Amino acid sequence: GSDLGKKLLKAARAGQDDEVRILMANGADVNATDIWDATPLHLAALIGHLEIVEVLLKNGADVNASDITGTTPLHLAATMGHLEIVEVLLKYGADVNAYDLNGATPLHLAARMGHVEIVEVLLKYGADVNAQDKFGKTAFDISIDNGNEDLAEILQAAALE
Amino acid sequence: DPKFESKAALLAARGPEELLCFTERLEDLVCFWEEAASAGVGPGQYSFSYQLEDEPWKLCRLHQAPTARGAVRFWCSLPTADTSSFVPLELRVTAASGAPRYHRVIHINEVVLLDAPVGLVARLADESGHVVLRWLPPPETPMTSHIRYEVDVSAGQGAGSVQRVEILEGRTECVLSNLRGRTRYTFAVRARMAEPSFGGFWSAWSEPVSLLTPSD
């Protein structure tokens, strides 16, 4: 792809907030992809740099971009425990029930990592409590498997509604 | 070899669901995770790939070993001595089917788990009633001038740990005061990188030494 796109992928991954803005002001492709079809938004959501996430989304980054594993930025933010980024992605229209090649939604991954607040934010945005991954596990099942009584209580109450 | 299993288990306790990477002497790197055993899963069923700077993506052979708690531990060992420290290293673990397992970005030597200091010796100071502690840095470990230490002082009976002393960066000795006479004290020392960008984790305690203080 573009030479600036390669630089933007490296700068986003490196957490260089200033360089990301400089590269974009110079016309860098906000939707450039690496060999895994990951975008700068993927890498920014992964390392938890909110300011990079913001300037990418404000300048047209694909909030629902999937890499070849079926992973979206919301998957990575939920997995890594970046609460505000999960909120920012969701308000910019990220698919709350997107599933990867494991059939795992952000609710599954947030539950597996024990992020109660992220689960709550996902639930408020319409996460499917009953969604099963390709192994038949729901987010609630995962909470039981990890002995997370807080998540189990929240997920159980959400299912009754 | 046994030390790695202790260190790996120590990190796994703080993050059971994570891909955990650490270095012991800043020249090698081990990344591992733990998961429940399954009838068909083995090292071949996962692909560990990594990209450093502008190098091509590379594959790392995965090893499988059991744990005391019955989880299966998968790990990869990458050389890092010639790599500049704190440069980004992107890591991916992918199932054979292409499904995601892990995706991380780490910085070289951002989680250092040193070996314990060695050669600890206690000595009655020339100033009566004081004890001087001296030790060697963790063996075969670079940047010894950037390692800080902590000294533990323990009594015999129920008193146990009576003192903890912080040793400034690069120092391999300290003088201990406020020790009770006619008392058998036990000393140990641990190490950590002082930056603290190297992680901020303490090593295991050194082999202990003991000493009987003089009267008065």
Swiss-Prot record, chain B:
Glycans are attached at residue 45. Changing residue 86 to A/L: Greatly reduced EPO binding. Changing residue 84 to A: Little effect on EPO binding. The chain holds residues 32 to 247 of 508 of the full protein. It comes from Homo sapiens (Human). A motif (WSXWS motif) lies at residues 202-206. Residues 116-216 form the Fibronectin type-III domain. Receptor for erythropoietin, which mediates erythropoietin-induced erythroblast proliferation and differentiation. Upon EPO stimulation, EPOR dimerizes triggering the JAK2/STAT5 signaling cascade. In some cell types, can also activate STAT1 and STAT3. May also activate the LYN tyrosine kinase. Belongs to the type I cytokine receptor family. Type 1 subfamily. On EPO stimulation, phosphorylated on C-terminal tyrosine residues by JAK2. The phosphotyrosine motifs are also recruitment sites for several SH2-containing proteins and adapter proteins which mediate cell proliferation. Forms homodimers on EPO stimulation. The tyrosine-phosphorylated form interacts with several SH2 domain-containing proteins including LYN, the adapter protein SH2B2, PTPN6, PTPN11, JAK2, PI3 kinases, STAT5A/B, SOCS3, CRKL. Interacts with INPP5D/SHIP1. SH2B2 binding inhibits the JAK-STAT signaling. Interacts with RHEX; this interaction occurs in a erythropoietin (EPO)-dependent manner. Interacts with ATXN2L. Erythroid cells and erythroid progenitor cells. It is found in: Cell membrane. The WSXWS motif appears to be necessary for proper protein folding and thereby efficient intracellular transport and cell-surface receptor binding. Residues 1-216 are extracellular. Changing residue 145 to A: 16-fold reduction in EPO binding. Disulfide bonds join 21-31, 60-76. The record marks 86 as: Required for ligand binding. This is Erythropoietin receptor. It is linked to Erythrocytosis, familial, 1: An autosomal dominant disorder characterized by elevated hemoglobin and hematocrit, hypersensitivity of erythroid progenitors to erythropoietin, erythropoietin low serum levels, and no increase in platelets nor leukocytes. It has a relatively benign course and does not progress to leukemia.
